[PDB]
Design an enzyme around this catalytic site. Structure first.
Site, PDB file in Angstrom:
ATOM      1  N   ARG A   1       0.843  -1.190   0.000  1.00 49.50           N
ATOM      2  CA  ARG A   1       0.000   0.000   0.000  1.00 49.50           C
ATOM      3  C   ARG A   1       0.878   1.238   0.000  1.00 49.50           C
ATOM      4  NH1 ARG A   1      -2.789  -1.231   3.903  1.00 49.50           N
ATOM      5  NH2 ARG A   1      -4.365  -2.279   2.593  1.00 49.50           N
TER       6      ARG A   1
ATOM      7  N   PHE B   1       1.279  10.613   2.087  1.00 51.96           N
ATOM      8  CA  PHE B   1       0.997   9.982   3.373  1.00 51.96           C
ATOM      9  C   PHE B   1       2.125   9.013   3.720  1.00 51.96           C
ATOM     10  CE2 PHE B   1      -2.221   7.106   5.805  1.00 51.96           C
ATOM     11  CZ  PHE B   1      -1.618   7.453   7.005  1.00 51.96           C
TER      12      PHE B   1
ATOM     13  N   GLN C   1       3.663   1.481   2.866  1.00 52.84           N
ATOM     14  CA  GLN C   1       3.508   0.406   3.841  1.00 52.84           C
ATOM     15  C   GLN C   1       3.998  -0.911   3.261  1.00 52.84           C
ATOM     16  OE1 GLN C   1      -0.373   0.065   5.508  1.00 52.84           O
ATOM     17  NE2 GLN C   1       0.006  -1.870   6.580  1.00 52.84           N
TER      18      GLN C   1
ATOM     19  N   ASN D   1      -0.099  -1.690  12.845  1.00 52.80           N
ATOM     20  CA  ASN D   1      -0.685  -2.616  13.806  1.00 52.80           C
ATOM     21  C   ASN D   1      -2.194  -2.698  13.624  1.00 52.80           C
ATOM     22  OD1 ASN D   1      -2.111  -0.640  15.484  1.00 52.80           O
ATOM     23  ND2 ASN D   1      -0.066   0.015  16.126  1.00 52.80           N
TER      24      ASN D   1
ATOM     25  N   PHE E   1       5.591   1.207   8.237  1.00 57.80           N
ATOM     26  CA  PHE E   1       5.369   2.179   7.185  1.00 57.80           C
ATOM     27  C   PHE E   1       6.431   3.257   7.257  1.00 57.80           C
ATOM     28  CE2 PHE E   1       3.162   5.500   9.777  1.00 57.80           C
ATOM     29  CZ  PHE E   1       2.808   4.748  10.888  1.00 57.80           C
TER      30      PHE E   1
ATOM     31  N   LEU F   1      -0.910   9.922  14.422  1.00 55.15           N
ATOM     32  CA  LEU F   1      -0.571   8.557  14.799  1.00 55.15           C
ATOM     33  C   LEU F   1       0.270   8.479  16.068  1.00 55.15           C
ATOM     34  CD1 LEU F   1       0.247   7.237  11.232  1.00 55.15           C
ATOM     35  CD2 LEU F   1      -1.917   7.016  12.480  1.00 55.15           C
TER      36      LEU F   1
ATOM     37  N   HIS G   1       1.066   4.288  17.133  1.00 52.41           N
ATOM     38  CA  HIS G   1       2.010   3.498  16.361  1.00 52.41           C
ATOM     39  C   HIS G   1       3.407   3.790  16.884  1.00 52.41           C
ATOM     40  CE1 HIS G   1      -0.912   2.197  13.260  1.00 52.41           C
ATOM     41  NE2 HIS G   1      -1.511   3.322  13.615  1.00 52.41           N
TER      42      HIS G   1
END
Ligand code: ZXX
EC number: 5.2.1.8
Length: 163
Positions: free
Chosen positions: A54, A59, A62, A101, A112, A121, A125
């Site tokens: 992804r 952004f 991943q 996660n 990521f 985040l 994370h």
């Protein structure tokens, strides 16, 4: 003392370039050690040959699902999942390396690489590293992503290890 690991990235099998990461073992030793060992393959499994499933421009990228190749798999060197070690480090901008996660204390191998500041985040994370060399290669990978994250070419970790 902080380990440096590298990924050699390929795009539909064609070499693109190398990304290296500093792993903050001084702040998150257990999380750093997981990523370091998966990058060398020394436990018999890890990131070599896996793909980035992804990629969302603006952004993050991943990857790390080396067992199911689609975001549903992966495992840590400790077992299927391990704890959120701490949240000392924050998502301060591009190049931050942080754990993916599925809830509290469910870290495996998926991670990521941020291409933007992702402060929402923080505390959810675990940040454990940052791109050292090759942020331009991450920026190149970004161009093969899309709004929904599907990649337009296969982005693989052709080789990886410790520097
Ligand atoms: C579109 O954003 C994502 O796909 C994010 C980016 C950060 C890393 N990540 C995860 O940790 C996502 C959770 C998440 C976080 C932030 C925003 C989201 O939409 C989804 N989790 C996953 O991909 C994992 N679990 C599930 C149930 O999908 C997988 C690691 C086993 N995926």
């Amino acid at each position: 003392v902080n380990p440096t690991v590298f990924f050699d990235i390929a795009v539909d099998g064609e070499p693109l370039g190398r990304v290296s990461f500093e792993l903050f073992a001084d702040k998150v030793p257990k999380t750093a050690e997981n990523f370091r060992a998966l990058s060398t393959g020394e436990k018999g499994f890890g990131y070599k040959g896996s793909c980035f499933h992804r990629i969302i421009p603006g952004f993050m990228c991943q990857g790390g699902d080396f067992t199911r190749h689609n975001g549903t798999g992966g495992k840590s060197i400790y077992g299927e999942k391990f704890e959120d070690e701490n949240f000392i480090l924050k998502h301060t901008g591009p190049g931050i390396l942080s754990m993916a996660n599925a809830g509290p204390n469910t870290n495996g191998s998926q991670f990521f690489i941020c291409t933007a500041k992702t402060e929402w985040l923080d505390g959810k994370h675990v940040v454990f590293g940052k791109v050292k060399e090759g942020m331009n290669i991450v920026e190149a990978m970004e161009r093969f992503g899309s709004r929904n994250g599907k990649t337009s070419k296969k982005i693989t970790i052709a080789d990886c290890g410790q520097l």
